[PDB]
Design an enzyme around this catalytic site. Structure first.
Site, mmCIF file in Angstrom:
data_model
loop_
_atom_site.group_PDB
_atom_site.id
_atom_site.type_symbol
_atom_site.label_atom_id
_atom_site.label_comp_id
_atom_site.label_asym_id
_atom_site.label_seq_id
_atom_site.Cartn_x
_atom_site.Cartn_y
_atom_site.Cartn_z
ATOM 1 C CG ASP A 68 10.786 3.769 2.396
ATOM 2 O OD1 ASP A 68 11.952 4.095 2.078
ATOM 3 O OD2 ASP A 68 9.790 4.027 1.687
ATOM 4 C CB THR A 69 16.253 4.441 5.310
ATOM 5 O OG1 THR A 69 16.706 4.000 4.023
ATOM 6 C CG2 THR A 69 16.439 3.338 6.335
ATOM 7 N N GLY A 70 14.124 5.908 3.140
ATOM 8 C CA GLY A 70 13.886 7.025 2.230
ATOM 9 C C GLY A 70 12.590 7.782 2.479
HETATM 10 C C1 LIG Z 1 9.787 -0.057 -8.860
HETATM 11 C C2 LIG Z 1 9.557 -0.991 -7.924
HETATM 12 C C3 LIG Z 1 8.719 -0.624 -6.699
HETATM 13 N N1 LIG Z 1 8.937 0.792 -6.373
HETATM 14 C C4 LIG Z 1 10.051 1.213 -5.758
HETATM 15 O O1 LIG Z 1 10.863 0.450 -5.235
HETATM 16 C C5 LIG Z 1 10.136 2.737 -5.570
HETATM 17 N N2 LIG Z 1 10.343 3.063 -4.146
HETATM 18 C C6 LIG Z 1 9.579 3.986 -3.538
HETATM 19 O O2 LIG Z 1 8.836 4.754 -4.150
HETATM 20 C C7 LIG Z 1 9.804 4.148 -2.023
HETATM 21 O O3 LIG Z 1 11.037 3.530 -1.649
HETATM 22 C C8 LIG Z 1 9.868 5.634 -1.671
HETATM 23 C C9 LIG Z 1 11.217 6.210 -2.099
HETATM 24 C C10 LIG Z 1 11.567 7.371 -1.171
HETATM 25 N N3 LIG Z 1 10.796 8.568 -1.537
HETATM 26 C C11 LIG Z 1 11.625 9.428 -2.128
HETATM 27 C C12 LIG Z 1 11.188 10.746 -2.224
HETATM 28 C C13 LIG Z 1 11.585 11.685 -1.280
HETATM 29 C C14 LIG Z 1 11.180 13.010 -1.403
HETATM 30 C C15 LIG Z 1 10.403 13.407 -2.485
HETATM 31 C C16 LIG Z 1 9.994 14.674 -2.579
HETATM 32 C C17 LIG Z 1 10.797 15.727 -2.356
HETATM 33 C C18 LIG Z 1 10.241 16.938 -2.590
HETATM 34 C C19 LIG Z 1 8.993 16.907 -3.234
HETATM 35 S S1 LIG Z 1 8.637 15.140 -3.406
HETATM 36 C C20 LIG Z 1 10.010 12.467 -3.431
HETATM 37 C C21 LIG Z 1 10.432 11.145 -3.321
HETATM 38 N N4 LIG Z 1 10.328 9.041 -0.564
HETATM 39 C C22 LIG Z 1 8.994 8.953 -0.396
HETATM 40 O O4 LIG Z 1 8.216 8.515 -1.245
HETATM 41 C C23 LIG Z 1 8.476 9.571 0.916
HETATM 42 N N5 LIG Z 1 8.386 11.033 0.780
HETATM 43 C C24 LIG Z 1 8.988 11.831 1.668
HETATM 44 O O5 LIG Z 1 9.697 11.332 2.542
HETATM 45 O O6 LIG Z 1 8.793 13.181 1.618
HETATM 46 C C25 LIG Z 1 10.035 13.860 1.406
HETATM 47 C C26 LIG Z 1 7.097 9.022 1.307
HETATM 48 C C27 LIG Z 1 7.124 7.490 1.302
HETATM 49 C C28 LIG Z 1 6.039 9.517 0.318
HETATM 50 C C29 LIG Z 1 6.744 9.522 2.714
HETATM 51 C C30 LIG Z 1 8.653 3.513 -1.225
HETATM 52 C C31 LIG Z 1 7.978 2.580 -2.001
HETATM 53 C C32 LIG Z 1 6.811 2.943 -2.660
HETATM 54 C C33 LIG Z 1 6.139 2.010 -3.441
HETATM 55 C C34 LIG Z 1 6.567 0.687 -3.480
HETATM 56 C C35 LIG Z 1 5.892 -0.221 -4.298
HETATM 57 C C36 LIG Z 1 6.258 -1.661 -3.933
HETATM 58 C C37 LIG Z 1 5.436 -2.646 -4.315
HETATM 59 C C38 LIG Z 1 7.718 0.317 -2.791
HETATM 60 C C39 LIG Z 1 8.394 1.253 -2.016
HETATM 61 C C40 LIG Z 1 11.255 3.333 -6.446
HETATM 62 C C41 LIG Z 1 11.815 4.599 -5.790
HETATM 63 C C42 LIG Z 1 12.386 2.316 -6.658
#
Ligand SMILES: C=CCNC(=O)[C@@H](NC(=O)[C@@](O)(CCCN(Cc1ccc(-c2cccs2)cc1)NC(=O)[C@@H](NC(=O)OC)C(C)(C)C)Cc1ccc(CC=C)cc1)C(C)C
Ligand SMILES: [Cl-]
Ligand SMILES: [Cl-]
Ligand SMILES: [Cl-]
Lengths: 99, 99
Positions: A25-27
């Site tokens: 997860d590069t995000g």
């Molecule tokens: C809908 C279909 C399934 N769902 C997804 O694919 C969803 N993906 C996802 O949610 C993810 O790709 C995460 C997206 C990246 N996310 C963005 C982010 C960055 C900063 C902030 C904040 C900034 C300031 C205040 S908050 C908020 C959000 N970053 C993080 O969450 C990271 N946070 C972090 O780095 O701290 C800055 C963390 C991981 C918490 C360390 C992972 C994922 C989770 C759940 C499932 C379920 C699968 C069964 C799959 C993948 C959405 C997006 C399509």
């Protein structure tokens, strides 16, 4: 390896002698795993995702193998939808994005 | 390009006549952007991650340009804390993970 993104980039990791599946997860800044047992003391951390913030347990200097590549670093444990390997460990195994 | 993961992999995108910064996110199934206007039909959707779910509007067949690479796909719009490019568009620009 080279991993395309037509499916979720799920790989096998090994931590505490056990195999798990996790998402590359590069995000994600950090690596967060579903509830499990790890050794030593932990510290508090709040991390933010798409839905808001959660509290997790931070363990430091934990050995973890990712697709057979050895890493040792910080692993957060808490109520995540999936095990996620974030940039803190992706960097240790030499991962880049390319297009 | 080759993009390092020492830092968050942020790029510029062009969408709906606007320039925006977005995160290349291999952990995201879908592309999700902060509130903006897009043309054409949409339908509501719940998407989930760490912290829980948010409601978004789903627009299909939206043209987007990401690092000079043109693609078309589904864009979700709602109260995401950050703009993310998900796998559905990463595939189209030939983005891979490598290590
Ligand atoms: C809908 C279909 C399934 N769902 C997804 O694919 C969803 N993906 C996802 O949610 C993810 O790709 C995460 C997206 C990246 N996310 C963005 C982010 C960055 C900063 C902030 C904040 C900034 C300031 C205040 S908050 C908020 C959000 N970053 C993080 O969450 C990271 N946070 C972090 O780095 O701290 C800055 C963390 C991981 C918490 C360390 C992972 C994922 C989770 C759940 C499932 C379920 C699968 C069964 C799959 C993948 C959405 C997006 C399509
Ligand atoms: Cl670390
Ligand atoms: Cl799509
Ligand atoms: Cl391909």
């Amino acid at each position: 390896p080279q991993i395309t993104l037509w499916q979720r980039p799920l790989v096998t990791i090994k931590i505490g002698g056990q195999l798990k599946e996790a998402l590359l997860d590069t995000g994600a800044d950090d690596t967060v795993l579903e509830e499990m047992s790890l050794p030593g003391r932990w510290k508090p951390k709040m991390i933010g995702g798409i839905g808001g913030f959660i509290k997790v347990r931070q363990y430091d200097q934990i050995p973890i193998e990712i697709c057979g590549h050895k890493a040792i670093g910080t692993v957060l444990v808490g109520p995540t939808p999936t095990n996620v390997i974030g940039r803190n460990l992706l960097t240790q195994i030499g991962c880049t994005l390319n297009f």
